[PDB]
Design a protein around this motif. Structure first.
Motif, mmCIF file in Angstrom:
data_model
loop_
_atom_site.group_PDB
_atom_site.id
_atom_site.type_symbol
_atom_site.label_atom_id
_atom_site.label_comp_id
_atom_site.label_asym_id
_atom_site.label_seq_id
_atom_site.Cartn_x
_atom_site.Cartn_y
_atom_site.Cartn_z
ATOM 1 N N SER C 4 -16.086 42.175 8.582
ATOM 2 C CA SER C 4 -17.364 41.461 8.453
ATOM 3 C C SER C 4 -18.499 42.320 8.992
ATOM 4 C CB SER C 4 -17.326 40.050 9.008
ATOM 5 O OG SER C 4 -16.742 39.200 8.018
ATOM 6 N N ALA C 5 -18.322 43.594 8.664
ATOM 7 C CA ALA C 5 -19.381 44.499 8.310
ATOM 8 C C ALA C 5 -19.704 44.073 6.899
ATOM 9 C CB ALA C 5 -18.854 45.899 8.288
ATOM 10 N N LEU C 6 -18.679 43.526 6.241
ATOM 11 C CA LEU C 6 -18.775 42.906 4.911
ATOM 12 C C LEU C 6 -19.966 41.977 4.787
ATOM 13 C CD1 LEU C 6 -15.412 41.953 3.291
ATOM 14 C CD2 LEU C 6 -17.238 43.376 2.481
ATOM 15 N N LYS C 7 -20.094 41.075 5.753
ATOM 16 C CA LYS C 7 -21.266 40.220 5.812
ATOM 17 C C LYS C 7 -22.536 41.062 5.846
ATOM 18 C CE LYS C 7 -23.274 36.647 8.715
ATOM 19 N NZ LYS C 7 -22.928 35.504 9.630
ATOM 20 N N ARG C 8 -22.647 41.889 6.878
ATOM 21 C CA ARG C 8 -23.787 42.771 7.047
ATOM 22 C C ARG C 8 -24.194 43.503 5.786
ATOM 23 N NH1 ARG C 8 -27.693 43.907 11.240
ATOM 24 N NH2 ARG C 8 -26.866 42.763 13.051
ATOM 25 N N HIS C 9 -23.227 43.968 5.013
ATOM 26 C CA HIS C 9 -23.584 44.654 3.792
ATOM 27 C C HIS C 9 -24.332 43.743 2.868
ATOM 28 C CE1 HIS C 9 -22.778 46.142 -0.420
ATOM 29 N NE2 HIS C 9 -23.402 47.154 0.149
#
Ligand SMILES: [Mg+2]
Ligand SMILES: [Mg+2]
Ligand SMILES: [Mg+2]
Ligand SMILES: [Mg+2]
Ligand SMILES: [Mg+2]
Ligand SMILES: [Mg+2]
Ligand SMILES: [Mg+2]
Ligand SMILES: [Mg+2]
Ligand SMILES: [Mg+2]
Ligand SMILES: [Mg+2]
Ligand SMILES: [Mg+2]
Ligand SMILES: [Mg+2]
Ligand SMILES: [Mg+2]
Ligand SMILES: [Mg+2]
Ligand SMILES: [Mg+2]
Ligand SMILES: [Mg+2]
Ligand SMILES: [Mg+2]
Ligand SMILES: [Mg+2]
Ligand SMILES: [Mg+2]
Ligand SMILES: [Mg+2]
Ligand SMILES: [Mg+2]
Ligand SMILES: [Mg+2]
Ligand SMILES: [Mg+2]
Ligand SMILES: [Mg+2]
Ligand SMILES: [Mg+2]
Ligand SMILES: [Mg+2]
Ligand SMILES: [Mg+2]
Ligand SMILES: [Mg+2]
Ligand SMILES: [Mg+2]
Ligand SMILES: [Mg+2]
Ligand SMILES: [Mg+2]
Ligand SMILES: [Mg+2]
Ligand SMILES: [Mg+2]
Ligand SMILES: [Mg+2]
Ligand SMILES: [Mg+2]
Ligand SMILES: [Mg+2]
Ligand SMILES: [Mg+2]
Ligand SMILES: [Mg+2]
Ligand SMILES: [Mg+2]
Ligand SMILES: [Mg+2]
Ligand SMILES: [Mg+2]
Ligand SMILES: [Mg+2]
Ligand SMILES: [Mg+2]
Ligand SMILES: [Mg+2]
Ligand SMILES: [Mg+2]
Ligand SMILES: [Mg+2]
Ligand SMILES: [Mg+2]
Ligand SMILES: [Mg+2]
Ligand SMILES: [Mg+2]
Ligand SMILES: [Mg+2]
Ligand SMILES: [Mg+2]
Ligand SMILES: [Mg+2]
Ligand SMILES: [Mg+2]
Ligand SMILES: [Mg+2]
Ligand SMILES: [Mg+2]
Ligand SMILES: [Mg+2]
Ligand SMILES: [Mg+2]
Ligand SMILES: [Mg+2]
Ligand SMILES: [Mg+2]
Ligand SMILES: [Mg+2]
Ligand SMILES: [Mg+2]
Ligand SMILES: [Mg+2]
Ligand SMILES: [Mg+2]
Ligand SMILES: [Mg+2]
Ligand SMILES: [Mg+2]
Ligand SMILES: [Mg+2]
Ligand SMILES: [Mg+2]
Ligand SMILES: [Mg+2]
Ligand SMILES: [Mg+2]
Ligand SMILES: [Mg+2]
Lengths: 83, 104, 99
Positions: C4-9
């Motif tokens: 949920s660097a996924l989110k950040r992206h």
RNA sequence: UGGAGAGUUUGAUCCUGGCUCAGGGUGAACGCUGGCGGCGUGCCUAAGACAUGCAAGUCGUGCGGGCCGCGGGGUUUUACUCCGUGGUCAGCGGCGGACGGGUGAGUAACGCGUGGGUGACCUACCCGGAAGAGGGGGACAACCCGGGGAAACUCGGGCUAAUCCCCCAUGUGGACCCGCCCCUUGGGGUGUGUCCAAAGGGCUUUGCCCGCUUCCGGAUGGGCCCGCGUCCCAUCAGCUAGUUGGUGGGGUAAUGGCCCACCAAGGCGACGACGGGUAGCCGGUCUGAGAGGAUGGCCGGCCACAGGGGCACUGAGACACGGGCCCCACUCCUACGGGAGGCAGCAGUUAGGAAUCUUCCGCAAUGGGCGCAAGCCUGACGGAGCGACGCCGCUUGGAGGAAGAAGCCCUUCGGGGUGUAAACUCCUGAACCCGGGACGAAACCCCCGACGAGGGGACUGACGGUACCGGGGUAAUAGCGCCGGCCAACUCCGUGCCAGCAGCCGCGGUAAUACGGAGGGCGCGAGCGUUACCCGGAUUCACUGGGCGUAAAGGGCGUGUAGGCGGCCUGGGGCGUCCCAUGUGAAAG
């Protein structure tokens, strides 16, 4: 921010910390801004905590945050004693 | 302090820029004898004020271009093409040292 | 896998658009204002000039521009606008400009 | 407080001169040997390829939900529907993911070191100060419905909250254009004109806690610029066209040919340009009497990199190791269309190599991120494990004990040696058993005081039943190299220019202190040797500190360029030089 905290300086099973002012982002044992005291938690010698409350207070006065033990040690050498 | 160097203008060939030649004596690390050695600084002359052969103080300053980071401060001693001709022969000799040679 | 660097992206994609469009707005306005100054349309070009100055200071309220990033684009603009009404102008609505 | 020399060119000599040895050092490896503990240290090669697990999350006190429960309501009862509440799941949103950890591939560069500049700049969180938060509007996930795909994933429709986004107002203040003022590069003031604010949450609810907005200041952290320093090849001598400068613009937080258009024809080089080679730099490390030489491995600082090459987006910060895009090489899935990876994070596997460790324990401490806190996360870290790899400490006993066993070895056949060594007598008691058993930890929290100062209390130990103490108690591992000279230590046998030794000189051709064994001796000793490499000796690249008639070395001779050097007297400056004060020279070493 910039922290007052302990840096590890003894040896294996023989811990001595230096109470230091440093940017909170350095490694704990890396280049610091200023040493203002030391700490032997084993109380091996009668002089096992030293501070310098002037610099201790200086740094505080520009919002260096102490850690939950640096503040503890600091307190004990009457940094925060105001009476 | 902004470094100030003193030298000799050996170029007018640009617009708003003069080339200053700055010498420096110093004892040599190992062998001790005092050696000369010198470097050319491109200096900023907005008025095209200083001329070929003027001796000028030069001052460390905010960049004006690549190469240019000094502006010409005061005039020290007026004209003297001896230092220039000196520097001029120096560069002329380069004509000889190559693969060939003859009459320069 | 999956973090949920996924989110950040995906988050950043959103802001990309907020910004993209803010910056777009300014250019097409700034140009407009300036372009109207070459034609010496004083009141109208200042009228646009002002709305431009706004979206610039406004873009700057958040992290689209912030900064002296504003002051540049803002300076850069009033300059070209006054310089260009040195074609007989008389700053009509005198909107964004000093006497 | 600091300086040793020796062997080898000759029949002999002096000199020149190389070679070699005695010293010190090591991330070592190799042989023979190997008992204990403490602290250090441990892929030098393939920046080769990687199985599996774990390594960066967190906040219900920003917001609205889905799923599985339980309780209480409206009604006469049900169906419906309202409220409270437990568990869990993601989503939106905030801060963190730019630190920490890994590596040295690239880089000869303001990369680094060092001293300065920034009127040319930025800085989230943190501290101080000034002022402020009034109306209104919107959207997208979640969820609901429908599709395409084998999968990774994906497209369409609809609903919706917020500390999400936007418009208006307030202007403490701030930005911008023009003018004036001081200042002097873009510093600070000032007058019109324009432009720019805000977010709510929580409560032991009018009164505080956590947040928000703008501005000034600080602290920390950074960008950029400059002087000087930073290896080898001149069998690389010429190089350059964004090249060099100018004007205007673009770009940035900010200077700048950083980029762009037009103009000028410049810029660099024998003080080594350009090219080629090699290389992370430093603090430091080893050596040295020093001056020097060598090195950059642990640790700390900076830099650069994350399979190879480009690139931007988000953001205070990245061109981003465990984020995105594209091209390339490699592996794996594949329904042929299309996907998924990136240990130079911790362990671990494999390959290469002379050679380099556990798929360990713990968040108890210290440190970091988020959180009001409770806490959560942390292969940072604290520990343990392995390896004589290193340093230090320690044991294998101690006192007695013959004119002096036996065996082995010499011999002049008389003896001499191993040798107080052994035996044996007595004494102590590593190992081992038994019992006590730590330090590292007192804060966060909670109570009193005011949520401050201060006082009171509670919790918590991986290491580990370890360290240390006490009681009991066994005579209990010794190797390795050397013995012609350098160089401490000689005798017998065996071999016969053979077998072999050998750092250099040299040994062996039947009496070898030089080979192999033996007795004996010398030196170190849980180690002893070997190989490799660095400095030393080597004044053997000579600054300190050398040479060139014959030892190696005077250019075949001139003329002369740059450069180096420069008689006597006076005066100015004060660049070299000298002196004083001062700042800097982090930590570790
Ligand atoms: Mg357009
Ligand atoms: Mg600019
Ligand atoms: Mg001879
Ligand atoms: Mg002889
Ligand atoms: Mg001799
Ligand atoms: Mg000799
Ligand atoms: Mg010596
Ligand atoms: Mg063995
Ligand atoms: Mg160990
Ligand atoms: Mg390596
Ligand atoms: Mg390594
Ligand atoms: Mg874990
Ligand atoms: Mg009911
Ligand atoms: Mg959640
Ligand atoms: Mg790192
Ligand atoms: Mg170089
Ligand atoms: Mg190179
Ligand atoms: Mg740079
Ligand atoms: Mg500055
Ligand atoms: Mg404040
Ligand atoms: Mg609304
Ligand atoms: Mg709506
Ligand atoms: Mg619903
Ligand atoms: Mg579907
Ligand atoms: Mg829709
Ligand atoms: Mg105002
Ligand atoms: Mg001015
Ligand atoms: Mg002003
Ligand atoms: Mg004004
Ligand atoms: Mg407004
Ligand atoms: Mg409230
Ligand atoms: Mg600062
Ligand atoms: Mg051109
Ligand atoms: Mg320009
Ligand atoms: Mg030319
Ligand atoms: Mg390299
Ligand atoms: Mg010497
Ligand atoms: Mg290093
Ligand atoms: Mg790799
Ligand atoms: Mg941005
Ligand atoms: Mg990784
Ligand atoms: Mg993997
Ligand atoms: Mg192998
Ligand atoms: Mg912890
Ligand atoms: Mg902690
Ligand atoms: Mg004895
Ligand atoms: Mg006894
Ligand atoms: Mg005893
Ligand atoms: Mg705790
Ligand atoms: Mg109370
Ligand atoms: Mg207390
Ligand atoms: Mg015995
Ligand atoms: Mg001898
Ligand atoms: Mg034979
Ligand atoms: Mg040798
Ligand atoms: Mg014989
Ligand atoms: Mg013989
Ligand atoms: Mg012999
Ligand atoms: Mg010998
Ligand atoms: Mg020497
Ligand atoms: Mg000589
Ligand atoms: Mg000769
Ligand atoms: Mg001659
Ligand atoms: Mg000759
Ligand atoms: Mg001459
Ligand atoms: Mg003289
Ligand atoms: Mg002279
Ligand atoms: Mg004089
Ligand atoms: Mg002087
Ligand atoms: Mg130091």
């Amino acid at each position: 921010m910039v922290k007052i905290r302990l840096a590890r300086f003894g040896s294996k099973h023989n811990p001595h910390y230096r109470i230091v002012v440093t940017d909170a982002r350095r490694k704990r044992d890396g280049k610091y801004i200023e040493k203002i005291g030391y700490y032997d938690p084993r109380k091996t010698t009668p002089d096992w905590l030293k501070v310098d409350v002037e610099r201790a207070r200086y740094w505080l006065s520009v919002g260096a945050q102490p850690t939950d033990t640096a503040r503890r040690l600091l307190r004990q050498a009457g940094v925060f004693r105001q009476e | 302090p902004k470094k100030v160097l003193t030298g000799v203008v050996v170029s007018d060939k640009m617009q708003k820029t003069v080339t200053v030649l700055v010498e420096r004596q110093f004892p040599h690390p190992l062998y001790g004898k005092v050696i000369k050695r010198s470097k050319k600084y491109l200096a900023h002359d907005p008025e095209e004020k200083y001329k070929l052969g003027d001796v000028v103080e030069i001052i460390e300053s905010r960049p004006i271009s690549k190469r240019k980071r000094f502006r010409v401060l005061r005039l020290v001693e007026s004209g003297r093409m001896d230092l220039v001709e000196k520097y001029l022969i120096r560069r002329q000799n380069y004509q000889s040292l190559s693969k060939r040679g003859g009459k320069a | 896998r999956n973090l949920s660097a996924l989110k950040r992206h995906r988050q950043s994609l959103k802001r990309r658009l907020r910004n993209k469009a803010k910056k777009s707005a300014i250019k097409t306005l700034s140009k407009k204002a300036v372009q109207l100054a070459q034609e010496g349309k004083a009141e109208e070009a200042l009228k646009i000039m002002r709305k431009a100055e706004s979206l610039i200071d406004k873009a700057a309220k958040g992290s689209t521009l912030h900064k002296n990033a504003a002051a540049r684009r803002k300076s850069r603009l009033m300059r070209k606008v006054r310089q260009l009404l040195e074609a007989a102008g008389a700053p009509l609505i005198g909107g964004g400009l000093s006497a």
